[PDB]
Design an enzyme around this catalytic site. Structure first.
Site, PDB file in Angstrom:
ATOM      1  N   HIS A  60       0.838  -1.230   0.000  1.00  0.00           N
ATOM      2  CA  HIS A  60       0.000   0.000   0.000  1.00  0.00           C
ATOM      3  C   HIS A  60       0.864   1.268   0.000  1.00  0.00           C
ATOM      4  O   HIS A  60       0.303   2.368  -0.220  1.00  0.00           O
ATOM      5  CB  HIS A  60      -0.942  -0.050   1.177  1.00  0.00           C
ATOM      6  N   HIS A  63       8.232   1.943   2.818  1.00  0.00           N
ATOM      7  CA  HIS A  63       8.784   2.381   4.107  1.00  0.00           C
ATOM      8  C   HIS A  63      10.306   2.458   3.996  1.00  0.00           C
ATOM      9  O   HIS A  63      10.910   1.579   3.333  1.00  0.00           O
ATOM     10  CB  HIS A  63       8.365   1.401   5.198  1.00  0.00           C
ATOM     11  N   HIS A  90       7.926   7.529   5.826  1.00  0.00           N
ATOM     12  CA  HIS A  90       7.173   7.124   4.620  1.00  0.00           C
ATOM     13  C   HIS A  90       6.320   8.315   4.168  1.00  0.00           C
ATOM     14  O   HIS A  90       6.335   9.384   4.851  1.00  0.00           O
ATOM     15  CB  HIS A  90       6.327   5.880   4.909  1.00  0.00           C
ATOM     16  N   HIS A  92       2.481   9.656   2.239  1.00  0.00           N
ATOM     17  CA  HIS A  92       1.140   9.386   1.678  1.00  0.00           C
ATOM     18  C   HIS A  92       0.928  10.329   0.497  1.00  0.00           C
ATOM     19  O   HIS A  92       1.507  11.431   0.498  1.00  0.00           O
ATOM     20  CB  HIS A  92       0.047   9.616   2.717  1.00  0.00           C
ATOM     21  N   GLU A 102      -2.806  13.834   4.270  1.00  0.00           N
ATOM     22  CA  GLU A 102      -3.735  13.226   5.244  1.00  0.00           C
ATOM     23  C   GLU A 102      -4.257  14.373   6.102  1.00  0.00           C
ATOM     24  O   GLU A 102      -5.495  14.598   6.114  1.00  0.00           O
ATOM     25  CB  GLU A 102      -3.002  12.134   6.021  1.00  0.00           C
ATOM     26  N   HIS A 115       5.579  11.387   6.780  1.00  0.00           N
ATOM     27  CA  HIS A 115       5.556  10.953   8.202  1.00  0.00           C
ATOM     28  C   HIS A 115       6.954  10.489   8.626  1.00  0.00           C
ATOM     29  O   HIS A 115       7.464   9.536   8.008  1.00  0.00           O
ATOM     30  CB  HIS A 115       4.533   9.856   8.400  1.00  0.00           C
ATOM     31  N   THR A 195      -2.574   6.369  11.090  1.00  0.00           N
ATOM     32  CA  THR A 195      -3.571   6.734  10.045  1.00  0.00           C
ATOM     33  C   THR A 195      -3.998   5.551   9.193  1.00  0.00           C
ATOM     34  O   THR A 195      -4.875   5.735   8.365  1.00  0.00           O
ATOM     35  CB  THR A 195      -3.081   7.902   9.192  1.00  0.00           C
ATOM     36  N   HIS A 196      -3.492   4.350   9.443  1.00  0.00           N
ATOM     37  CA  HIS A 196      -4.016   3.106   8.850  1.00  0.00           C
ATOM     38  C   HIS A 196      -3.976   1.994   9.897  1.00  0.00           C
ATOM     39  O   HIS A 196      -3.381   2.167  10.959  1.00  0.00           O
ATOM     40  CB  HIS A 196      -3.321   2.789   7.522  1.00  0.00           C
TER      41      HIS A 196
HETATM   42  O1  LIG Z   1       0.590   6.464   8.697  1.00  0.00           O
HETATM   43  B1  LIG Z   1       0.737   5.583  10.001  1.00  0.00           B
HETATM   44  O2  LIG Z   1      -0.326   4.446   9.863  1.00  0.00           O
HETATM   45  O3  LIG Z   1       0.397   6.577  11.047  1.00  0.00           O
HETATM   46  C1  LIG Z   1       1.543   7.396  11.199  1.00  0.00           C
HETATM   47  C2  LIG Z   1       2.623   6.679  11.976  1.00  0.00           C
HETATM   48  C3  LIG Z   1       3.024   5.407  11.263  1.00  0.00           C
HETATM   49  C4  LIG Z   1       4.278   4.833  11.464  1.00  0.00           C
HETATM   50  C5  LIG Z   1       4.699   3.768  10.679  1.00  0.00           C
HETATM   51  C6  LIG Z   1       3.855   3.247   9.714  1.00  0.00           C
HETATM   52  C7  LIG Z   1       2.584   3.785   9.544  1.00  0.00           C
HETATM   53  C8  LIG Z   1       2.129   4.891  10.295  1.00  0.00           C
HETATM   54 ZN   LIG Z   2       1.822   7.590   7.620  1.00  0.00          ZN
END
Ligand SMILES: [O][B]1([O])O[C][C]C2=[C][C]=[C][C]=C21
Ligand SMILES: [Zn+2]
Ligand SMILES: [O][B]1([O])O[C][C]C2=[C][C]=[C][C]=C21
Ligand code: NA
Ligand SMILES: [Zn+2]
Lengths: 256, 257
Positions: A60, A63, A90, A92, A102, A115, A195-196
């Site tokens: 998706h 990283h 990473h 978005h 986001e 992020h 956020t996911h």
């Molecule tokens: O976008 B995410 O789901 O929220 C921010 C923090 C984080 C950290 C590592 C992978 C994903 C996410």
């Molecule tokens: Zn993120």
């Protein structure tokens, strides 16, 4: 879970009921409703480029992971008493330049969002332990505004041709992601969530007021990543941004 | 102007280019039960000078690899031709899926992509501009590309694409012999036809190779990640550029084999 019609943000609540929680992210930051907070210290990042480890296609998104066995790479200051250890960054992005961030500011959507994610190594002994704790994660969000090519993105964009399909991974070394941050680290902070999925309410957000640039063609490089595994029909990663969620009476604080 | 969208696509081309409904339009389906063996068809010989390779360019609907065509260093001869034809370009066609991206079909079977290697009649004409509208002006080798193993011969071409992402970008592309992209066997079908997109001139002697070459799913994705837009506009991927097959209208497809 994904970002499709069937497995997407609007459906995440069936498998992850926290999706309808009181501390969900991202949010719309309304500048007329932020509280200037005089106790917020400046944000201090100190990252060692030797902690950069690997880039991975996670289907998706992609990283960039860091070695997180010690405090070579840390976030301090802002609303925090504890030192937070860098583990990943990473992006978005959206299907077109019109949306892709986001977080939004006064309803304005940017083209993408960075992020930079950290875990509380003062209180917890691992990411795995920290990731579900209210004070476990600290994430810098940077709004990316479509305009001039961003040369700081170069090493990252140049690495994607080695991880085109789901599960591919490659070494990604000698990189300091503080080089991607805006010149000013003036920020908003609020208590929120991943956020996911799994959408844990474990994130103290640090949202930069200053945007960074990205070109139309740089965004196309993100969207040309493939969500399918090698040898399957190509399925471009068109978007991975979650809609903004209700504040439910949380306060967004301003450092400025 | 014209494209491959519903608005400006092949079903609409006849409005701006009436020849689109002509008697010698390409591509065609080759029905192998109806091909005629012609003893007068010599083997194809290609002798290409890799120093003639010049430039790669994003043309909005596709990308072209152009060759210097000032002399006959790089030539096609044999097959149905008395004259030598001078190499000027190669390019590809592909589709929105791996199931149909070729232009020519064989017994109704659609391949994943197609290579065109284009040549102009430098025996009879002095320029491409002169040769291009002439019944005997152009000779084009078509090679069907079947999705499977990665084709390493495509490497230098696919590596060049990052320098030409948007419409009108171009880069030097040198020291390349495109005969390295052809199948081992050059058994062929030939028929009189046309350019497969505007201006659709009925000027092409087609040489369709019996044997296919490979291409991977990820290699086709690299073609589709090219952008049809100019730099700075919202990115619009080049998803497909294959014309449907057109009626034979009494033409004969001849076989070398
Ligand atoms: O976008 B995410 O789901 O929220 C921010 C923090 C984080 C950290 C590592 C992978 C994903 C996410
Ligand atoms: Zn993120
Ligand atoms: O696909 B096409 O229109 O017919 C093949 C021959 C040729 C040569 C140069 C550019 C385009 C074309
Ligand atoms: Na023969
Ligand atoms: Zn063609």
């Amino acid at each position: 879970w994904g970002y499709d019609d069937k497995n997407g943000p609007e459906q995440w609540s069936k498998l992850y009921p926290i999706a309808n929680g009181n501390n969900q992210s991202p949010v719309d930051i309304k500048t007329s409703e932020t509280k200037h907070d005089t106790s917020l210290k400046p944000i201090s990042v100190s990252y060692n480029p030797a902690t950069a480890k690997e880039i991975i296609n996670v289907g998706h998104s992609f990283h960039v992971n860091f070695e997180d066995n010690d405090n070579r790479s840390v976030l301090k200051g802002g609303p925090f008493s504890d030192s937070y250890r860098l583990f990943q960054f990473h992006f978005h992005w959206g299907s077109t330049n019109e949306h892709g961030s986001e977080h939004t500011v006064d309803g304005v959507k940017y083209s993408a969002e960075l992020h930079v994610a950290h875990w509380n190594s003062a209180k917890y002994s691992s990411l795995a332990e920290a990731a579900s704790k209210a004070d476990g994660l600290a994430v810098i969000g940077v709004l990316m505004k479509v305009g001039e090519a961003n040369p700081k993105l170069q090493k990252v964009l140049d690495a994607l041709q080695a991880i085109k399909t789901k599960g591919k991974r490659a070494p990604f070394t000698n990189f300091d992601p503080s080089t991607l941050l805006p010149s000013s680290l003036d920020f908003w902070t609020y208590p929120g969530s991943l956020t996911h999925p799994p959408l844990y309410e474990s994130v103290t957000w640090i949202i930069c007021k200053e945007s960074i640039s990205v070109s139309s063609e740089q965004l196309a490089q993100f969207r040309s990543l493939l969500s399918n595994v090698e040898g399957d029909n190509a399925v471009p990663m068109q978007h991975n941004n979650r809609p903004t969620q209700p504040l439910k009476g949380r306060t967004v604080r301003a450092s400025f």
